[PDB]
Design an enzyme around this catalytic site. Structure first.
Site, PDB file in Angstrom:
ATOM      1  N   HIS C  43      84.488  29.772 -49.107  1.00 26.46           N
ATOM      2  CA  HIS C  43      85.492  30.598 -48.494  1.00 26.46           C
ATOM      3  C   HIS C  43      86.910  30.143 -48.712  1.00 26.46           C
ATOM      4  O   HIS C  43      87.859  30.911 -48.540  1.00 26.46           O
ATOM      5  CB  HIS C  43      85.138  30.926 -47.032  1.00 26.46           C
ATOM      6  CG  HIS C  43      85.628  29.875 -46.121  1.00 26.46           C
ATOM      7  ND1 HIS C  43      84.779  28.900 -45.642  1.00 26.46           N
ATOM      8  CD2 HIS C  43      86.862  29.643 -45.624  1.00 26.46           C
ATOM      9  CE1 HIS C  43      85.497  28.114 -44.844  1.00 26.46           C
ATOM     10  NE2 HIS C  43      86.759  28.527 -44.822  1.00 26.46           N
ATOM     11  N   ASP C  99      78.181  28.508 -47.475  1.00 28.70           N
ATOM     12  CA  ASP C  99      79.577  28.430 -47.785  1.00 28.70           C
ATOM     13  C   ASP C  99      79.831  27.132 -48.573  1.00 28.70           C
ATOM     14  O   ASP C  99      80.153  26.089 -47.994  1.00 28.70           O
ATOM     15  CB  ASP C  99      80.211  28.385 -46.403  1.00 28.70           C
ATOM     16  CG  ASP C  99      81.706  28.530 -46.469  1.00 28.70           C
ATOM     17  OD1 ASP C  99      82.258  28.783 -47.577  1.00 28.70           O
ATOM     18  OD2 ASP C  99      82.296  28.187 -45.424  1.00 28.70           O
ATOM     19  N   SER C 199      89.272  23.232 -43.423  1.00 29.68           N
ATOM     20  CA  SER C 199      88.082  23.766 -44.031  1.00 29.68           C
ATOM     21  C   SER C 199      87.890  23.267 -45.422  1.00 29.68           C
ATOM     22  O   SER C 199      88.874  23.035 -46.106  1.00 29.68           O
ATOM     23  CB  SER C 199      88.147  25.278 -44.082  1.00 29.68           C
ATOM     24  OG  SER C 199      88.367  25.756 -42.775  1.00 29.68           O
TER      25      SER C 199
HETATM   26  C1  LIG Z   1      82.791  35.532 -39.842  1.00 34.85           C
HETATM   27  N1  LIG Z   1      82.918  34.205 -39.268  1.00 34.85           N
HETATM   28  C2  LIG Z   1      81.766  33.342 -39.468  1.00 34.85           C
HETATM   29  C3  LIG Z   1      84.062  33.822 -38.731  1.00 34.85           C
HETATM   30  O1  LIG Z   1      84.269  32.677 -38.407  1.00 34.85           O
HETATM   31  N2  LIG Z   1      84.957  34.775 -38.634  1.00 34.85           N
HETATM   32  N3  LIG Z   1      86.206  34.400 -39.167  1.00 34.85           N
HETATM   33  C4  LIG Z   1      86.304  34.498 -40.627  1.00 34.85           C
HETATM   34  C5  LIG Z   1      87.093  33.444 -41.410  1.00 34.85           C
HETATM   35  C6  LIG Z   1      86.881  33.293 -42.931  1.00 34.85           C
HETATM   36  C7  LIG Z   1      88.148  33.534 -43.793  1.00 34.85           C
HETATM   37  N4  LIG Z   1      88.332  32.901 -45.148  1.00 34.85           N
HETATM   38  C8  LIG Z   1      87.084  33.901 -38.276  1.00 34.85           C
HETATM   39  O2  LIG Z   1      86.740  34.000 -37.079  1.00 34.85           O
HETATM   40  O3  LIG Z   1      88.259  33.472 -38.772  1.00 34.85           O
END
Ligand SMILES: CN(C)C(=O)NN(CCCCN)C(=O)O
Ligand SMILES: *[C@@H]1O[C@H](CO)[C@@H](O)[C@H](O)[C@H]1NC(C)=O
Lengths: 10, 36, 253
Positions: C43, C99, C199
Site C-alpha cells: 500500500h 500488504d 507504514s
Molecule cells: C481499509 N483499511 C484496512 C483501512 O485501514 N482503511 N484505511 C485505508 C488506508 C490505506 C491507504 N493507502 C484507513 O482507515 O486509512
C-alpha cells in the site's frame, strides 16, 4: 522540511 | 536474502557484534517469558 | 510513532526510508533484507482508491539514516530501485490482505555500522515468537500523534502481540491469517503505536535462541494512532515467506 539531497541521486 | 534472513543477518554491528545491548531490548527478552 | 523514544544510533540498521523524489517527502518505512532487497507494504506503493500508484522511477530508498530530514553525509546511502514487486494477491479493495512488496535495488548497498540487513523468520522462529504477550519493536519517522507533530530522529516503541480474537473484536474490518495485531490494551496503562509515515516499516523481534533480529511483521494498517481499544495490524511476514523466496530466486537476490 527535507534537506536537499545530492543531485547525483536525482 | 531469505530463509532465516541472511547470514550475518539480524546481528547489529554496534550492538550484538560488540556485545552491547540497546536500551530497551531487555523489555523484549523479558516478555518471551525472560530471555536466553 | 506515537509514544515511542528516540532510537539509539545504529539500533535498526535495517530501517529503510522510502523517499519521494518529487515533491521530496517521506512515503513510508521499509526494511533491508539483503544487500539488494528491500521489504515494504504494498500500500505504500499502490492504493487505487486514493490514486496512489508509485513507480520505480518515482522513488528513492535511503538507508542508514537516523535524522528524518537531514541528508546524513557520509552515513546514509541513497539508492535507486531496479524493480518493484507487489504480491499478486494484495487485497487493496477490501482489507489490505497481503500488504507486502519487494523492491530490488539498482545496486547492492554496502553494509557498514549503520546499514545491515534483518533476518526473515523461519517456521520455527515464527512458531516460537509469534505469541500473544510477546513484544516486538516498531520503528519509524512517522507522526508522533494522530493530528498535531513530527520527530527529528528515528523513533522506536516495543509492543506486545495481541490475541487474534481481541484483534478481530476491535474492528469491523475482516482480519485474515496474513495479519496480526499488536499493541497494549486500554487496561494496560502503556501506549504506543505506529502512525502516519511509519507504514511499510518493520515489526521485529530478537530471538532468545540465537540473538538475532527477525522481522516478523510490516506496519500495515490501523484505525487512528494509539487509540484506546484499537490495535495496529501488521503483515505476517512468515506466512508470506514463500512468495518472498519465490521472488528473490526467480529474479535476483
Ligand atoms: C481499509 N483499511 C484496512 C483501512 O485501514 N482503511 N484505511 C485505508 C488506508 C490505506 C491507504 N493507502 C484507513 O482507515 O486509512
Ligand atoms: C499502476 O501503474 C501501472 C503502470 O505503471 C499500471 O500497469 C497498473 O495498471 C497500475 N495499477 C492499477 C491502475 O491498478
Amino acid at each position: 522540511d527535507f534537506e536537499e539531497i545530492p543531485e547525483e541521486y536525482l | 536474502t531469505f530463509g532465516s534472513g541472511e547470514a550475518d543477518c539480524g546481528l547489529r554491528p554496534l550492538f550484538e557484534k560488540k556485545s552491547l545491548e540497546d536500551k530497551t531490548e531487555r523489555e523484549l527478552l523479558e516478555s518471551y517469558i525472560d530471555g536466553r | 510513532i506515537v509514544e515511542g523514544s528516540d532510537a539509539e544510533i545504529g539500533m535498526s540498521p535495517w530501517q529503510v526510508m522510502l523517499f519521494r523524489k518529487s515533491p521530496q517527502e517521506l512515503l513510508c518505512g521499509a526494511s533491508l533484507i539483503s544487500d539488494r532487497w528491500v521489504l515494504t507494504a504494498a500500500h505504500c506503493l499502490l492504493y487505487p482508491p486514493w490514486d496512489k500508484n508509485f513507480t520505480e522511477n518515482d522513488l528513492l530508498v535511503r538507508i542508514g539514516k537516523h535524522s528524518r530530514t537531514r541528508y546524513e553525509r557520509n552515513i546514509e546511502k541513497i539508492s535507486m530501485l531496479e524493480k518493484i514487486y507487489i504480491h499478486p494477491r494484495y487485497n487493496w479493495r477490501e482489507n489490505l490482505d497481503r500488504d507486502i512488496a519487494l523492491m530490488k535495488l539498482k545496486k547492492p548497498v554496502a553494509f557498514s555500522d549503520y546499514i545491515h540487513p534483518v533476518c526473515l523468520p523461519d517456521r520455527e522462529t515464527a512458531a516460537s515468537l509469534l505469541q500473544a504477550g510477546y513484544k516486538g519493536r516498531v520503528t519509524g519517522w512517522g507522526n508522533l500523534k494522530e493530528t498535531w507533530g513530527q520527530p527529528s530522529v528515528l523513533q522506536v516503541v516495543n509492543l506486545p502481540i495481541v490475541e487474534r480474537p481481541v484483534c478481530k473484536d476491535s474492528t469491523r474490518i475482516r482480519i485474515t491469517d496474513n495479519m496480526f495485531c499488536a499493541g497494549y490494551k486500554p487496561d494496560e496503562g502503556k501506549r504506543g503505536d505506529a502512525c502516519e509515515g511509519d507504514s511499510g516499516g518493520p515489526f521485529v523481534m530478537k530471538s532468545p535462541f540465537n540473538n538475532r533480529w527477525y522481522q516478523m511483521g510490516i506496519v500495515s494498517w490501523g484505525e487512528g494512532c494509539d487509540r484506546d481499544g484499537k490495535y495496529g495490524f501488521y503483515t505476517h511476514v512468515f506466512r508470506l515467506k514463500k512468495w518472498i523466496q519465490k521472488v528473490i530466486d526467480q529474479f535476483g537476490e
